[PDB]
Structure formats: structure tokens, C-alpha cells
Amino acid sequence: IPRPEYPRPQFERTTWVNLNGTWTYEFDLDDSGKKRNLPTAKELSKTITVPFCPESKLSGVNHTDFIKKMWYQRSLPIPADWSNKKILLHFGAVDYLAEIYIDGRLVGFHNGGSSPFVIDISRIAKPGNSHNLVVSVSDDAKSGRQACGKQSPEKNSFACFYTRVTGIWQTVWMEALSPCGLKSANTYPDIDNNQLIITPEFYQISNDQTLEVTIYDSQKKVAQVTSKCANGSNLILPIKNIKLWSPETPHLYDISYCVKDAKGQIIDEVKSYVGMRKVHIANGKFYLNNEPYFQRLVMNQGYYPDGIWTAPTDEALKNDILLSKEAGFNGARLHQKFFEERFHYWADKLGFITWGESPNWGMNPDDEVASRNLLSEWIEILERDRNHPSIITWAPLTVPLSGTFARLVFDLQKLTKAIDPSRPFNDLTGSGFHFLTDIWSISTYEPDATRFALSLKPDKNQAAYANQPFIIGEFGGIVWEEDALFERIEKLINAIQSSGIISGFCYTQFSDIEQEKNGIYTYDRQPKFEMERIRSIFEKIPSRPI
Ligand SMILES: [Mg+2]
Ligand SMILES: [Mg+2]
Ligand SMILES: [Mg+2]
Ligand SMILES: [Mg+2]
Ligand SMILES: [Mg+2]
Ligand SMILES: [Mg+2]
Ligand SMILES: [Mg+2]
Ligand SMILES: [Mg+2]
Ligand SMILES: [Mg+2]
Ligand SMILES: [Mg+2]
Ligand SMILES: [Mg+2]
Ligand SMILES: [Mg+2]
Ligand SMILES: [Mg+2]
Ligand SMILES: [Mg+2]
Ligand SMILES: [Mg+2]
Ligand SMILES: [Mg+2]
Ligand SMILES: [Mg+2]
Ligand SMILES: [Mg+2]
Ligand SMILES: [Mg+2]
Ligand SMILES: [Mg+2]
Ligand SMILES: [Mg+2]
Ligand SMILES: [Mg+2]
Ligand code: NA
Ligand code: NA
Ligand code: NA
Ligand code: NA
Ligand code: NA
Ligand code: NA
Ligand code: NA
Ligand code: NA
Ligand code: NA
């Protein structure tokens, strides 16, 4: 079974099934599948390896041309000892519109090709029996309604656009739990008050139901509290001598969640973790844990030669972060894609700061329906990723290459502040223009290093300018297939270093991708250059100044 690992490792139960592996599929050229009763089909015409999209080699299908409509199918065995449980069916992502059938009946649907969804099958699922699961998939970027990221709008890859991703591109899985279990737990690290706040949510709360929370440093229990179950009520976990999370020291505390019925019997157990860290802007600087922090970022566009949007293995996700740090970067912009959850896990574990962004390219910037679609995907991703210490900035919009766009800029700023005030917000990347931002990013690919140094200033005449930390969001981009190359990159880093007013940078980019040969690494993650040299250049500006 491919990608067998637990797909939600910051909220982990043991009672799950991985549904990756061999499914059946069909392309539906004339959109006739419903006429041909595909929802009651027990086997479709061909086979595919989920969770790899059909454009991928790892799917075994390798069909890169446009796929407008397709169908997936497999048998869904429900384990016998899931008796009388709540049973959830989870899809990480399906591009773009998914309609879910069980035993031929429509049980759910999801609009948004990059965001997770869940179907409560508690009422339909018959433990110790097998159902027929059929998934209908639509994908039509030409509509202008879809957030596509870097997926090519042309048949072939060209310029900065790459291979498409249709259908199921993340792990499909099921879990069973108490009807009265823990739906979620938001973690709020508060380093100024030496404590962790937890806000729980339960599916249902019975007679005298309690939740017990224990915090661990390794095996050492450092905090514990019990409470009577109430949605949205605060549990306070005091932590003396907090071990702070940073890229340089990625310390995590373990959490156990224990839900008990009126008899003190355990009905639900969940495992989690947290990184005790604080991020805020003040006085023109960016602060990690109440001290300045210099961001040494590389642009990561999250493409893999054999899996396209899908990492071939857990190891390939982890390895992108290790290769990023070996090049001297302390973090990445996660660009034009919602990354897989386990990527944020390895960023949490290995020590790596990230910007969470969106695949906003490929939407018609005059279509309010495109705006409507991105707002809901964005909410789903904030819900999915809000507990990750590695994410230290949200940046949901890159300018594309008519106030609908300006309206969406302000709506995402207000929505994101309301959902998550813990992280700085960057309203707009890829230009020098801002509407309302915590972060003053600019983009400069000026090849001449004298002209480059002079481009290194914010436009303070813009109404939005309010002494925000100044970040070079995009620079470099040097195309390659040596000493000459190293000089060029070193000249840019020294100009940034000499500036005295810059809070961080992001180098374009981590790896080559198809025709774009502007990575530090090849597309198959091989060094292009003497790594000792690369690292000594990109590491020159320290994480912690002076
Ligand atoms: Mg997995
Ligand atoms: Mg589970
Ligand atoms: Mg894939
Ligand atoms: Mg999926
Ligand atoms: Mg989806
Ligand atoms: Mg069915
Ligand atoms: Mg579109
Ligand atoms: Mg969308
Ligand atoms: Mg596509
Ligand atoms: Mg697939
Ligand atoms: Mg690969
Ligand atoms: Mg995995
Ligand atoms: Mg995406
Ligand atoms: Mg991350
Ligand atoms: Mg959209
Ligand atoms: Mg930032
Ligand atoms: Mg943005
Ligand atoms: Mg709009
Ligand atoms: Mg950008
Ligand atoms: Mg901009
Ligand atoms: Mg960049
Ligand atoms: Mg190299
Ligand atoms: Na996964
Ligand atoms: Na889900
Ligand atoms: Na979907
Ligand atoms: Na993309
Ligand atoms: Na982006
Ligand atoms: Na994001
Ligand atoms: Na974006
Ligand atoms: Na962005
Ligand atoms: Na915005």
C-alpha cells in the first residue's frame, strides 16, 4: 500500500483504515457515467494506484492530457469491531469537484481541488460488511472558477507552468470513534504567560462526560488537567521552563487526550503535539519568541517528477526539508499549492519555518464564483493546519501575470485575522504593491547587482506602508544546465546583507521543475553545485542577529 503513514499526525487515533492502493477508474469523455449506472458499478474498466493522479507515472496510468470527467471505484470493507461507532470517510484532496456514492446513493460532495473533506457514514456503514464506493470527479480549469496553482492551462508545460493533477492526489482513509468523542482540539501556545491553552470540540457530550489532557516532555509529564466536556471552553496547561520551538531547536511537547463517560470508562483517545512558539511584528522587525528572526527562505512549489503534486513516499517529503536546510535555508515559501499535512509534520519535527499560501493562479480574477470557491478552500485549510508551529505567516494571494481581486484581498485579510490572529498576514506576493499587510514583501529579479542593491527599498508612498518588516519575497532565479554562478548568487546575498533594513528573503527556487531549470537542486533532488559553497553563501546572514 502506497503512502501508508497516518495522514493526520497532529490529531492521531489508532482505529483507522488506509484506503490507498489499487482502485478501478474510467475516463468519461461524453459525461454519460450516470446514464450507464456507474454509481452501481462493482468494477470500472481500468486500474489506478491511489493516491497518485492519472497524469503521474506512479498512478500507472501516465495520461497528461486534459481529463474533464472521471470515475473511481473500490470495495469499502467496514471492520466488524467498529460496531456502534461513529464512522468517518476522509479524502485529503480530489481535484476539482467530487461526488461521493456509497451502494449507489449520493452521500456527499466537495467543491475545491486542494482541500480535505469528510463524510459521516455512521448511519449507512454496516460493520462486518463491504459497501460499493464510487467517486465522480470533474475538473475544468477553463471555467475560470478553480484555484489551479501552477497546473498548465496549455496542453504542454511551458514558462513557469507544469503537469496537471486530476482526481485523488492524497490519502483516502476511514476512522471509527465514540459518537461522543473529540472532534478537534485547537492548541494556543502562550509563552508570555508560561502556559498552553486548549479549546476542545466534541461531536456530542453525554451525562457526566470529562476530558483529561496530559502534556509530556519526552516521558516527563509537565502538565495535566481534567474538565467537564463543553465545546469552546478553555483548558489551561501551565508549563514551567518552556523549551521554545525554533528551526535551530525544534522542541515539541507531546499531548494525550482522554475522554471518559459517567462511569470513568475511556470512550476516546487521541494523540497530538505542540511547539511552544510565538510570532509577531513590532517596530519594523519580525519576532520569533520575542527576539528578532531573519527568514532565510527558499521557494518550494511542491512538485515531484513521478507523483506530480503527490510525494512518492513519506521519505521524499522529509528529504525536501533536509535538502533545504543543507543549502543553508531556515524555511520555505510553500508556493501555489496547499501542501500535504505530513509536510507540516516534518517541518514541525526537523525545524523549518513556512509561509502557508494557496493555489490562487488559474482563477478568473473577475469571477466572484472563483472568489467564493477560494474562500471555502482557504477556511478548510486554516481548520486543517492552524496547530502547526512551523507555519509562521499566511500569504494566500500571489498577483496573477475590476475590483473583484481587490475585494478578495480584503476579504481574505479579515477572514484570516478572525480565524487565526496568532500569525502575521501577508496580503499580496509577487509585486511591490500591498492593500493591507503585516509583511512588506517585494519581488526583484534585476540581474545587475548595482541596480539590484538600489531596488532594495520599500515604496513608503503607498497608503498601506506602516513600517512593516521588509522581506525580499522573490529574487535570484538563476537558470543553470560554476565560479561565475557562485559570484552572481553571492553578490545578491551581500547586497541583502549590506542593506541593514531587510528582515528576510526567499530564493527562487528549491528545485528545477520540468523545463524550469532555476533550482538549487535538480527535479530529482540531486545537487547541481558544490554544496559547501552554496551553504556558506545562503547561511551568511544568521537566524538570530548580532
Ligand atoms: Mg498517508
Ligand atoms: Mg484515526
Ligand atoms: Mg499525484
Ligand atoms: Mg483524497
Ligand atoms: Mg479536495
Ligand atoms: Mg456506490
Ligand atoms: Mg479556473
Ligand atoms: Mg478553488
Ligand atoms: Mg487539473
Ligand atoms: Mg488517483
Ligand atoms: Mg518522484
Ligand atoms: Mg505518507
Ligand atoms: Mg494545491
Ligand atoms: Mg510547514
Ligand atoms: Mg477558485
Ligand atoms: Mg513573514
Ligand atoms: Mg499573499
Ligand atoms: Mg472577490
Ligand atoms: Mg510570490
Ligand atoms: Mg505584492
Ligand atoms: Mg522566492
Ligand atoms: Mg546544488
Ligand atoms: Na499522507
Ligand atoms: Na478529511
Ligand atoms: Na473536491
Ligand atoms: Na501548483
Ligand atoms: Na502561492
Ligand atoms: Na496555506
Ligand atoms: Na498564493
Ligand atoms: Na502568496
Ligand atoms: Na489577502
XYZ file of C-alpha atoms and ligand atoms in Angstrom, residues 55 95 139 151 164-166, ligand 9:
8
model
C -1.038 12.313 -15.121
C -9.221 17.903 -7.979
C -12.000 19.229 -13.463
C -1.069 23.453 -13.398
C -1.811 18.860 -14.270
C -3.253 16.917 -11.268
C -6.715 15.315 -11.723
Mg -6.120 19.700 -13.158
